[PDB]
Design a protein around this ligand. Sequence first.
Ligand SMILES: Nc1ncnc2c1ncn2[C@@H]1O[C@H](COP(=O)(O)OP(=O)(O)O)[C@@H](O)[C@H]1O
Ligand SMILES: Nc1ncnc2c1ncn2[C@@H]1O[C@H](COP(=O)(O)OP(=O)(O)O)[C@@H](O)[C@H]1O
Ligand SMILES: Nc1ncnc2c1ncn2[C@@H]1O[C@H](COP(=O)(O)OP(=O)(O)O)[C@@H](O)[C@H]1O
Ligand SMILES: [Mg+2]
Ligand SMILES: [Mg+2]
Ligand SMILES: [Mg+2]
Lengths: 56, 527, 528, 533, 53
Amino acid sequence: GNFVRVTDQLGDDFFAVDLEAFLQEFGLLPEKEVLVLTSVRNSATCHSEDSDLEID
Amino acid sequence: MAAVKTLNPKAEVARAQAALAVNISAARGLQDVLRTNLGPKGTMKMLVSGAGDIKLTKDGNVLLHEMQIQHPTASLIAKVATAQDDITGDGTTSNVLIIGELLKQADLYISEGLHPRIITEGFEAAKEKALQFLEEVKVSREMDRETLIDVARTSLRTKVHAELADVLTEAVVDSILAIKKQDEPIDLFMIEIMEMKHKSETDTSLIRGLVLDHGARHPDMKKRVEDAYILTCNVSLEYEKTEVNSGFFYKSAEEREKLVKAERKFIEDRVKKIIELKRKVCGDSDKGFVVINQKGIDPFSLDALSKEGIVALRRAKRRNMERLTLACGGVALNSFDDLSPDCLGHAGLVYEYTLGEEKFTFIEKCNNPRSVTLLIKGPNKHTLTQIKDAVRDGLRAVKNAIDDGCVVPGAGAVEVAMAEALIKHKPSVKGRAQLGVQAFADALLIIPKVLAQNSGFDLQETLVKIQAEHSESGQLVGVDLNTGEPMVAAEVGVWDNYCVKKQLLHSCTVIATNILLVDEIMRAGMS
Amino acid sequence: GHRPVLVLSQNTKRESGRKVQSGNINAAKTIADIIRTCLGPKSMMKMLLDPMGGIVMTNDGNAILREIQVQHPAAKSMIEISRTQDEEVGDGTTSVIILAGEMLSVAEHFLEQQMHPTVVISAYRKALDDMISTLKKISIPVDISDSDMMLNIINSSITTKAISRWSSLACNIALDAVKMVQFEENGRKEIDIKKYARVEKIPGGIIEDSCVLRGVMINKDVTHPRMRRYIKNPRIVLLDSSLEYKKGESQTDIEITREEDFTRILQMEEEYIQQLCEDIIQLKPDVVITEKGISDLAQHYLMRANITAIRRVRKTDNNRIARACGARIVSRPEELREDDVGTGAGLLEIKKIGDEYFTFITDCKDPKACTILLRGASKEILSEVERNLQDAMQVCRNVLLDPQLVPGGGASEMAVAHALTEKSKAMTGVEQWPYRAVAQALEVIPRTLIQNCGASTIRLLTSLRAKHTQENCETWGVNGETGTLVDMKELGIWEPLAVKLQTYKTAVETAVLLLRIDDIVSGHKKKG
Amino acid sequence: ALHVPKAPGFAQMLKEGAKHFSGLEEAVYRNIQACKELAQTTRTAYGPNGMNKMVINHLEKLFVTNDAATILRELEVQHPAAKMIVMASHMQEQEVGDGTNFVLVFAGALLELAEELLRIGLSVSEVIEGYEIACRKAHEILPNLVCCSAKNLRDIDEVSSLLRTSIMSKQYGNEVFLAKLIAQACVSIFPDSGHFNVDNIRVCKILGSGISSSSVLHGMVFKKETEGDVTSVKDAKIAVYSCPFDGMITETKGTVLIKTAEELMNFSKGEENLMDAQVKAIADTGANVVVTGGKVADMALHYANKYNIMLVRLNSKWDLRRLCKTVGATALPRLTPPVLEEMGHCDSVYLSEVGDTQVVVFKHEKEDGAISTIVLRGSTDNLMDDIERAVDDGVNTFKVLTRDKRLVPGGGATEIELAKQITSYGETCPGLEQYAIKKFAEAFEAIPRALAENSGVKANEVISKLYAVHQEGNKNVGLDIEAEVPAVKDMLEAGILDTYLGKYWAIKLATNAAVTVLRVDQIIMAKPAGGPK
Amino acid sequence: FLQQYRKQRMEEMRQQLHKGPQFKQVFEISSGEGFLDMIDKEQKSIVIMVHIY
Ligand SMILES: Nc1ncnc2c1ncn2[C@@H]1O[C@H](COP(=O)(O)OP(=O)(O)O)[C@@H](O)[C@H]1O
Ligand SMILES: Nc1ncnc2c1ncn2[C@@H]1O[C@H](COP(=O)(O)OP(=O)(O)O)[C@@H](O)[C@H]1O
Ligand SMILES: Nc1ncnc2c1ncn2[C@@H]1O[C@H](COP(=O)(O)OP(=O)(O)O)[C@@H](O)[C@H]1O
Ligand SMILES: [Mg+2]
Ligand SMILES: [Mg+2]
Ligand SMILES: [Mg+2]
């Protein structure tokens, strides 16, 4: 992306909608992915011996 | 210094008296600018954008949008005026004036050590009493043509020049009366506003039909049809590709020719259906057939329709489907599977008008059109924009006067009477809220003051004359902008929308109360 | 270039000792002082300027704190505390910040001496347990079936907000919304104000015209003018799948060799659309709502059965409509059943407000979702009104879940402080001083109320303490509008026990968390 | 005590680049000064003696003209009041086609006299009301000043005499020859039906031989060559196709599926045979000229050469439509042979060279047809552009004459008579509007004054003589251009006449522009920022 | 009139009501080497947008 003097094609009162559309129409902005707005946190990642195992 | 600036060093903060002074200064600046807009004797403003486009206007909302202002209080007042314009369509200048005068009158007492909360309580009590008085003073009437003419004149004379206002008054009143159905809400989407740039500003008028900003795209199409069958459709008459990546495969030139000829049969079937219907309804040549399509028509179908003497229009507006259905009287079709003569609208005259490169189509002489169009004409773009804004204001005024069964006398008479009632009611209010009631009455008195000032007369002498005349007889007397003497607005014909006054009171009181209670302004989102 | 030998990075800053503790405590005190004046029935509003250009005019603590960007991590912790209080109970956001600041101040008093922070923390935890016990002791029950008392509770919750002028209307709206959105299924009760009970604000009009709708209102119009815009007793069908011909998942290139195959393919596209529409029509509905697009041919075939169609509706709005009209969203039209048809909506009407079309489904019998239609002066006024209504609904839900009630106006603070002070007389240890100090730190709420009212803080607070030393004066607080002592069982200001418990717990744990830090390291790379 | 702070209120709230002008001196006088300056810039190019101007736009394009509308268009006007006056001039050009300089001069004079009236004490409202009253009076008076009518538009001599005055202002030296050319071109067009189309007159500019070598051709001229070998046809039977002269192809995607050696060896032969059959079928209808809007295939060109068919390729769809109109053919969408009614006809189609340009000429022997072409010669591109502008002015004058046949005397005679009558009317009007009416009447003096100034004589003497002779009772007397001293003569006999519609619309538009400029009281200008287009 | 993008207003609506936690600030590069090793490091398949101001 080689955007210079973005005010020429956006103005001085451009909002986030204008910049989002302007970036989308050149296909540089990654597509929007739906995600949970807010939730509780878990903060765990695999590791070792993280396995309940049946008694035997 | 302040607590906020310690956590965020580069934070802009105004506390208590500083914040209140900032808000009141911004409101007073807005009021000072918009004072000259009020009344038919107001001065035209000239607005030049960054690109250099010229806009001449007197509208309060337009001026608020086009001033180069970056103040927060100005932003709030602009939002309030925008809501006023969106709902009622009038009273934005009065909105700004009343807000500014309320803030000034409140500051008159707050600077004497009085707490703003008492002023806000007085404002609430005065607003309640004022609403009661306004309900008492409204003039319920049967909205005949004359009353609507008076209301439309009272709006347009303020908006535009007197002769242009006289023309636009009849235009808007007739347009509203044409589309109005008994005991039904008025849909203003059914009055098309079309701009043409060739004649004088007084040549604007009302067409009991529709005007389309596009014409027939085939040279052999007829330029004028006397008796027209209108077919409003939303079916694509141009070539369409298969959704599932069809592609063609052939082994010879003859096979390629056969595939080329056979790939257009789908659209040709619908064109054949249209042609068959046209031949059925009008076997002779006098009657005409007009096709208005929301979708596109490829040149092959255009030629096929032209060879049968059918004028066709493509890529029409989406709202034009409903507008043509209500005006001509047909049925908008999304498919041609079962099309019968009962789905065809009728127009008593369809002709094409060309203005430079731009192309127009007129549909007139309908039986009883429930959707009409207003043709704005003028020599300049800014003239067209100003006339369009004036027409919007007038249409809103007439629609409000019809929806409401009543109408309020104008010329500031209602403001003077309401202020007198508030002054009389003031002793009934217990505590120090009487100061807020007095401030509210004085703020309400701004409209006759500004009207007299714009007309050139002395503000105080005219105001005291109006008040003395009102108190002596009890009549609803307003300011005469020609002589400065008291005048009965109801008798003369100066009318104001009841809903506009009610919205003014409610919004102005709410925003003034909220601004007065603000004691701390922050901008601490950086770093 | 030049190479200086280093253990940590150049941009790594480390500070420790009494300076860190003092800095944390003063940061918390400054955060409290920012919103100190926004508490009580006589609070003053503040203008917040967004970095995005917006304006926030509010006296709610959470909005003010969330609009402020800070560098000190203690202030960040305080703002997180404010957000936690807002999310948990929805009220008491301003009180918890002030309480945390006062507790940290009285802790700093001891940390200036030679008392270890762990002793202060243990005393604070003992005090918190005693506050919980006292609050549960002085609480009173409420009758949820009594509408008048619930309205009074909501009013006392909203008397401190800008919407207090229209108190009765706001209370009725909040109570009706919470009551009708209340749901019970599979033995699991729920309220779910977040998903349902949507608040829609349309600027303009008067706020006295605001009401809670007996159904759902959306900003939509019919797909085509021939649709009926007014249906008496509609049967509503909700869908997610598009009513238009779409590509398949797999690569499905065709190969046309015969002449008629192209027209045949187009005809089968039309036939597939017609088959979908006929499958929909088989249930004989009146309204069809889709989360995705509806083709023009589909609109025509639906018109042939005289069915109104609305497309491109948000998933949340469609779920709200399903709850309101008692319908079930169906993906495949061929799998529609009779019980999936929404019967129970007593009116559907598309009317024009301003210059926009709005769709109303507002006559449902026993609706489980609602739209709170807010009309007012402008956008910021309506945003503040929505925030106040959210506070009212949160308080109503808290009372419905927990029917315990606690006196307000600082009466509970003084009662708990007196009980803890009396209890501290029989410990005879070194922890009695921090215990008593954090007990008396609860008096910052009545003091703040008196200061905001403009009365004499010292005389009124001394009189209130003397009154609370008596034998039955647990309900004696301060009148925040007149600056006089009054019994709260006469004034009528009562608050849910859940809100008070959450406020005290959060304040004490914030003080405990900020009292455990003596070292600050900053500037290191995130490393990830 | 060293700096003056901004006033509290709107002054402090104004943006950094914005400008606010309010009040009489700050707004109205500045606008009037800007409009006066614009009128002064354009003034010296008024009338037959008006000098040309060299204008270079932002793209280094050079314009040498005395047309006011062209000069204003090529100028970078920045002041917005002058912008409104320029819009009024352009609207006059669009509506009528002539009188733009009149609009500019009248608006400038009106605004100057309005400034004088405001200075002496009158308000803006009084000046505007008086100007409107005087404009109504002038529009009422104007029909009584009509001296003669066209009374015939199919006669070459009459049309040339009528258009001589119109195209005498531009190219003063040689106007009879241009008048004859434009008269012939317009008489070719304008059939028994009363409608007249300006577009039906085409102008082709070819360098080399001076404008005296210009001629009018009954047909069309295209600056291109022929695709095939045939370059001349004597009994043309043009068939016009909008489709490319090539085998038609599918719209989705075309793939030649070959499954055997026979298909591979036969595909190209079959394609060539199909092309030959199609071209032979086209040629069997008697068509000897084929015009296409698309590309020409190699095999199609080969078979057109084999059957002696002249190929002309037109890129522009407008040119194709104009050729169909001027020849009488229908643009077939496919490559089918044309039916008898769809076949075009022309007296001669041939390839010719004019100067150093290769052209294809569709020539009609009869002095008829739907489209006529004026071939302009000359020694410079700018000279031919100016001659084309003069031709446009003449054609617009002919169109106006078709709309309305009434004429009023030129050379400032109509303006002087209007000034006298409006002054007489305003002398009988009691009130403060009489000053504005008299100033509106005086503003008409700017036309004879400008004519006299450009002619090189003293304007005051000319105006005094005009008033004397008009008080005597002669309302058809204007200044004598061909005189070294201030002199006047009758122009009903001299034939110096200008259209009634032009005067009517010019007066209306100039008055409207002046009133609109006067109505402005406050100006708020945003930061210029960018926006190149 | 679909080009006027009525949906832009509601896009702004939920962009304003986006999230609950703190919205954070745009990262500021203080040294040229900081920009150089910010762009040089970090995963390649992730877009990086820099605003010169
Ligand atoms: N002919 C008149 N005589 C006296 N007062 C008038 C007349 N026409 C309009 N007004 C007053 O002018 C006001 C309208 O001013 P206007 O410029 O429309 O402000 P806004 O745009 O805010 O409504 C009304 O309150 C009305 O009372
Ligand atoms: N009429 C009243 N008189 C005295 N105190 C009141 C009154 N109404 C509310 N309060 C007190 O004000 C507090 C509510 O303040 P508020 O602005 O809601 O802060 P928060 O959002 O933190 O609860 C409650 O603790 C209550 O005791
Ligand atoms: N031979 C002539 N003698 C005197 N006046 C003439 C002659 N030819 C033209 N005029 C005058 O010149 C004026 C035309 O000026 P022109 O340069 O065409 O300005 P515009 O293009 O705005 O009309 C007409 O009003 C006409 O009266
Ligand atoms: Mg108005
Ligand atoms: Mg609260
Ligand atoms: Mg001329």
